[PDB]
Enzyme design. Structure first.
Site, PDB file in Angstrom:
ATOM      1  N   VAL A  30       0.822  -1.202   0.000  1.00  0.00           N
ATOM      2  CA  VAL A  30       0.000   0.000   0.000  1.00  0.00           C
ATOM      3  C   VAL A  30       0.860   1.258   0.000  1.00  0.00           C
ATOM      4  CG1 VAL A  30      -1.549   1.413   1.392  1.00  0.00           C
ATOM      5  CG2 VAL A  30      -2.112  -0.980   0.937  1.00  0.00           C
ATOM      6  N   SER A  32       4.915   3.134   1.437  1.00  0.00           N
ATOM      7  CA  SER A  32       6.144   3.201   2.212  1.00  0.00           C
ATOM      8  C   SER A  32       6.213   4.572   2.865  1.00  0.00           C
ATOM      9  CB  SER A  32       7.374   2.959   1.331  1.00  0.00           C
ATOM     10  OG  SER A  32       7.185   1.844   0.475  1.00  0.00           O
ATOM     11  N   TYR A  35       8.719   6.008   8.830  1.00  0.00           N
ATOM     12  CA  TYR A  35       9.132   5.127   9.912  1.00  0.00           C
ATOM     13  C   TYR A  35       8.590   3.712   9.777  1.00  0.00           C
ATOM     14  CZ  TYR A  35       9.880   9.819  11.685  1.00  0.00           C
ATOM     15  OH  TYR A  35      10.264  11.135  11.820  1.00  0.00           O
ATOM     16  N   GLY A  36       7.905   3.403   8.686  1.00  0.00           N
ATOM     17  CA  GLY A  36       7.385   2.070   8.475  1.00  0.00           C
ATOM     18  C   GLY A  36       6.776   1.971   7.096  1.00  0.00           C
ATOM     19  N   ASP A 149      -1.640  18.902  13.066  1.00  0.00           N
ATOM     20  CA  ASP A 149      -1.219  18.871  11.668  1.00  0.00           C
ATOM     21  C   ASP A 149      -2.298  18.242  10.800  1.00  0.00           C
ATOM     22  OD1 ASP A 149       0.438  19.423   9.530  1.00  0.00           O
ATOM     23  OD2 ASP A 149       1.534  17.525   9.695  1.00  0.00           O
TER      24      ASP A 149
HETATM   25  C1  LIG Z   1       4.896   8.501  14.383  1.00  0.00           C
HETATM   26  C2  LIG Z   1       3.650   8.634  15.214  1.00  0.00           C
HETATM   27  C3  LIG Z   1       2.505   8.198  14.578  1.00  0.00           C
HETATM   28  N1  LIG Z   1       1.594   8.427  15.517  1.00  0.00           N
HETATM   29  C4  LIG Z   1       0.307   8.142  15.301  1.00  0.00           C
HETATM   30  C5  LIG Z   1      -0.685   8.369  16.254  1.00  0.00           C
HETATM   31  C6  LIG Z   1      -2.020   8.066  16.028  1.00  0.00           C
HETATM   32  C7  LIG Z   1      -2.412   7.520  14.816  1.00  0.00           C
HETATM   33  C8  LIG Z   1      -1.462   7.279  13.837  1.00  0.00           C
HETATM   34  C9  LIG Z   1      -1.889   6.684  12.523  1.00  0.00           C
HETATM   35  O1  LIG Z   1      -2.985   7.004  12.097  1.00  0.00           O
HETATM   36  N2  LIG Z   1      -1.072   5.833  11.891  1.00  0.00           N
HETATM   37  C10 LIG Z   1      -1.329   5.225  10.697  1.00  0.00           C
HETATM   38  C11 LIG Z   1      -1.995   5.874   9.658  1.00  0.00           C
HETATM   39  C12 LIG Z   1      -2.226   5.236   8.441  1.00  0.00           C
HETATM   40  C13 LIG Z   1      -1.775   3.936   8.244  1.00  0.00           C
HETATM   41  O2  LIG Z   1      -1.973   3.303   7.047  1.00  0.00           O
HETATM   42  C14 LIG Z   1      -3.201   2.891   6.607  1.00  0.00           C
HETATM   43  C15 LIG Z   1      -3.424   2.753   5.241  1.00  0.00           C
HETATM   44  C16 LIG Z   1      -4.677   2.328   4.798  1.00  0.00           C
HETATM   45  N3  LIG Z   1      -5.649   2.058   5.674  1.00  0.00           N
HETATM   46  C17 LIG Z   1      -5.460   2.185   6.998  1.00  0.00           C
HETATM   47  C18 LIG Z   1      -4.230   2.597   7.497  1.00  0.00           C
HETATM   48  C19 LIG Z   1      -1.078   3.293   9.258  1.00  0.00           C
HETATM   49  C20 LIG Z   1      -0.859   3.934  10.475  1.00  0.00           C
HETATM   50  C21 LIG Z   1      -0.129   7.582  14.092  1.00  0.00           C
HETATM   51  C22 LIG Z   1       2.053   8.948  16.661  1.00  0.00           C
HETATM   52  N4  LIG Z   1       3.391   9.090  16.463  1.00  0.00           N
END
Ligand SMILES: Cc1cn(-c2cccc(C(=O)Nc3ccc(Oc4ccncc4)cc3)c2)cn1
Length: 341
Positions: A30, A32, A35-36, A149
């Protein structure tokens, strides 16, 4: 001893090695990230599509480990349909020595507002989307968590325009089109309505198809913002803690404000009125999420039962702690072991 916990298989996703439990099948790249990386997969226990984020070397430094831990805890804490949350969390590691990464499992979101933006929406679609945004913001704000943000790329949507807020609660010339003026200029202390400014900016962009505020530097963005808000009067000016900024404002040509009816000549009166009340420089007069949810713009969709608050504040606890990478791995490992879906 083991190489990885039982019931895990190894498969390449987007040309990197992933280790997944057996219940998650058909992984598909999906995205890159910084941090992951993220794939989609099927939970064969129900055939539901989920997103899985593989954290990339979270234990390389204390900064990385604290960041990973914070994302885990924030996702775990929130329980709201318009806030992305945690379905599952796992690691293939069988020990702390073997502990190199972990994976977050979340509901799959097809796309986001940035990808479907650029174009002008119907006011009913704007009503529905912004209503969902404000519900999610009311919830995280009620947990004591601000986004800071919020932008279209942070607002995930599926095909039915169901919306979830991403990346809540986290230099150079990065784009800041959606950030509140008090954050960019640090000219007074901010509150949770910093996110409401962002909502205004996004809503305007849906109404017009055009980004409301740009600018090559903070002064140019301020000039563009004052084109819309007008130069603020002495009540606002007295609240500035930046004396140089105060002097700058008081020395400008004192251009009056609005007729958002004139600025947005195709918006309904209720849309322009809500925009007027969200794009407000005075952080004490700008609408909160809960107040914006009561606005007539949302009457066709409004359901106070859906406008829930968090029952407990977000509470970490170790947020100020300075620990070793090993100790952070211990805490993260504990949290993963103790999780329950
Ligand atoms: C570095 C850091 C990150 N966060 C943080 C805090 C709360 C939520 C998320 C997040 O939404 N993360 C997230 C968003 C989208 C993602 O990817 C998808 C893609 C498609 N569908 C669902 C998720 C995966 C994780 C990230 C706090 N510090």
């Amino acid at each position: 001893s083991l190489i990885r916990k039982k019931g895990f298989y190894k498969q390449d996703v987007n040309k990197t090695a992933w280790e997944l439990p057996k219940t998650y099948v058909s992984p598909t790249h999906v995205g890159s990230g910084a941090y992951g990386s993220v794939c989609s997969a099927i939970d064969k226990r129900s055939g539901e599509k989920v997103a899985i984020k593989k954290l990339s070397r979270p234990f390389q430094s204390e900064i990385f480990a604290k960041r990973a831990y914070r994302e885990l805890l924030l996702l775990k804490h929130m329980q709201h349909e318009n806030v992305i949350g945690l379905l599952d969390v796992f690691t293939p590691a069988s020990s702390l020595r073997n502990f190199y990464d972990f994976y977050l499992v979340m509901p799959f979101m097809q796309t986001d507002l940035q990808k479907i933006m650029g174009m002008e929406f119907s006011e009913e679609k704007i009503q529905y989307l912004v209503y969902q945004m404000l519900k999610g913001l009311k919830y995280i704000h009620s947990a004591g968590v601000v986004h800071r943000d919020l932008k279209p790329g942070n607002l995930a949507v599926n095909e039915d325009c169901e919306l979830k807020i991403l990346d809540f609660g986290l230099g150079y010339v990065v784009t800041r089109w959606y950030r509140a003026p008090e954050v960019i200029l640090s000219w007074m202390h901010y509150n949770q309505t910093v996110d409401i400014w962002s909502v205004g900016c996004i809503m305007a962009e849906m109404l017009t198809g055009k980004t409301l505020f740009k600018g090559k530097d903070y002064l140019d963005q301020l000039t563009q913002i004052l084109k819309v808000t007008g130069v603020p009067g002495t009540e606002f000016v007295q609240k500035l803690n930046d004396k140089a900024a105060k002097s700058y404002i008081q020395s400008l040509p004192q251009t009056p404000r609005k007729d958002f009816t004139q600025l947005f000549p195709r918006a309904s009166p209720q849309a322009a009125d809500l925009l007027e009340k969200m794009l407000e420089l005075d952080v004490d007069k700008r609408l909160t999420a809960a107040q914006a949810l009561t606005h007539p713009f949302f009457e066709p969709f409004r359901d106070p039962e859906e406008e829930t608050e968090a029952q407990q504040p977000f509470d970490d606890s170790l947020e100020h702690e300075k620990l070793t990478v090993d100790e952070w791995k211990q805490h993260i490992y504990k949290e993963i072991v103790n999780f329950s879906p």
